[PDB]
Write an enzyme that holds these catalytic residues in place. Sequence first.
Site, short mmCIF file in Angstrom:
data_model
loop_
_atom_site.label_atom_id
_atom_site.label_comp_id
_atom_site.label_asym_id
_atom_site.label_seq_id
_atom_site.Cartn_x
_atom_site.Cartn_y
_atom_site.Cartn_z
N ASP A 184 43.77 39.01 29.44
CA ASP A 184 43.24 39.76 30.58
C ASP A 184 42.58 38.79 31.56
OD1 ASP A 184 42.50 41.97 32.08
OD2 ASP A 184 40.95 42.58 30.72
N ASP A 203 35.31 38.12 27.98
CA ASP A 203 36.16 39.29 27.72
C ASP A 203 37.51 38.90 27.14
OD1 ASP A 203 37.21 41.83 27.48
OD2 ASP A 203 36.96 42.40 29.67
N1 LIG Z 1 27.27 36.63 33.60
C1 LIG Z 1 27.84 37.23 32.58
N2 LIG Z 1 28.29 38.49 32.72
C2 LIG Z 1 28.86 38.95 31.63
C3 LIG Z 1 29.01 38.32 30.42
N3 LIG Z 1 29.63 39.16 29.52
C4 LIG Z 1 29.83 40.26 30.21
N4 LIG Z 1 29.39 40.18 31.51
C5 LIG Z 1 29.43 41.20 32.56
O1 LIG Z 1 29.71 42.43 31.94
C6 LIG Z 1 30.96 42.95 32.41
C7 LIG Z 1 31.68 43.64 31.29
O2 LIG Z 1 31.98 42.68 30.32
P1 LIG Z 1 33.48 42.75 29.70
O3 LIG Z 1 33.59 41.94 28.46
O4 LIG Z 1 34.41 42.30 30.77
O5 LIG Z 1 33.75 44.28 29.40
P2 LIG Z 1 34.93 45.17 28.94
O6 LIG Z 1 34.49 46.23 28.05
O7 LIG Z 1 35.84 44.27 28.01
N5 LIG Z 1 35.73 45.76 30.25
P3 LIG Z 1 37.13 45.33 30.99
O8 LIG Z 1 38.21 44.87 29.94
O9 LIG Z 1 37.55 46.48 31.79
O10 LIG Z 1 36.77 43.94 31.76
C8 LIG Z 1 31.66 41.75 33.04
O11 LIG Z 1 32.47 42.21 34.08
C9 LIG Z 1 30.49 41.02 33.66
O12 LIG Z 1 30.07 41.73 34.84
C10 LIG Z 1 28.54 36.97 30.28
O13 LIG Z 1 28.65 36.22 29.35
N6 LIG Z 1 27.97 36.51 31.43
MG LIG Z 2 37.79 43.65 28.23
#
Ligand SMILES: Nc1nc2c(ncn2[C@@H]2O[C@H](COP(=O)(O)OP(=O)(O)NP(=O)(O)O)[C@@H](O)[C@H]2O)c(=O)[nH]1
Ligand SMILES: [Mg+2]
Length: 288
Positions: A184, A203
């Site tokens: 992704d 992610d």
């Molecule tokens: N700065 C920062 N933001 C983070 C971190 N982990 C998550 N985020 C924030 O949290 C959001 C969601 O995290 P994510 O892992 O992408 O979520 P998800 O459930 O897998 N959703 P999707 O697959 O739709 O991206 C990210 O878009 C970002 O805004 C990190 O290590 N650092």
């Molecule tokens: Mg994700």
Amino acid sequence: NVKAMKYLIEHYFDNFKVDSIEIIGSGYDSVAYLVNNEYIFKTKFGYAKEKAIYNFLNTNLETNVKIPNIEYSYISDELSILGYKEIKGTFLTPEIYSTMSEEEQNLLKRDIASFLRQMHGLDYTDISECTIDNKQNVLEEYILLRETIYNDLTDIEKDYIESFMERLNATTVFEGKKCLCHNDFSCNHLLLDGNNRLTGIIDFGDSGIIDEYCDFIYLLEDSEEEIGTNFGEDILRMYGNIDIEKAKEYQDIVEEYYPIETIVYGIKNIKQEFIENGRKEIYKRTYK
Ligand SMILES: Nc1nc2c(ncn2[C@@H]2O[C@H](COP(=O)(O)OP(=O)(O)NP(=O)(O)O)[C@@H](O)[C@H]2O)c(=O)[nH]1
Ligand SMILES: [Mg+2]
Ligand SMILES: [Cl-]
């Protein structure tokens, strides 16, 4: 939402105190929280694979690029929570990229290619259960369509789907190298430091062993949210030893599949709103 999740964090992780908590992001069936201005907690009411991937990669990658390192996890059928320290930085966007000097842009691309080269090169035996066959998944989704709503679709809808399946049956882009992919790998998952260099990647929730071409799908996308085809192409040239025309055919097939994927999500989760959005999207695409 925040109070409930504060309660659950404190209840499942014995000595952890929540002094602050806000929503930092959210999908259609997950929410992510920033706790104590220092920890990300991803939650869902799956995370076992994502955890096994972080743990595999933190053991086996040699890189200065940071990725989540899981300190807290609770996994059950009804609730899953992963917590890790927030990787600090700024998310890459088209706006940021266009303000970078030519040489800054090159270095960022080199960083990305180097990361991908390293991850795609890992011996994946220890994670070998995490296989994903995209072609087989699509066939199983199509069978599900035929068993549920296919006969109530319009002819324009049916033609779009059949025309996609004819293309899937003729393509050779699923017959190439398989490896561990982020799966992704869009620019909203890439973090930059103060010098506009790649400092982190988040992610890996869809990661698995899958076609090498998978990690270029967003790098090669032309849209408001991604940087552009040229970005992906240059990264592909730096990555090397990959057929760029097939990478683009793979991206093109995945983009054709999107509305059907959306319909299928609606069937599987009993969400009519998604069945309707995908069907409408078929009409939008057909009338370009
Ligand atoms: N700065 C920062 N933001 C983070 C971190 N982990 C998550 N985020 C924030 O949290 C959001 C969601 O995290 P994510 O892992 O992408 O979520 P998800 O459930 O897998 N959703 P999707 O697959 O739709 O991206 C990210 O878009 C970002 O805004 C990190 O290590 N650092
Ligand atoms: Mg994700
Ligand atoms: Cl509908």
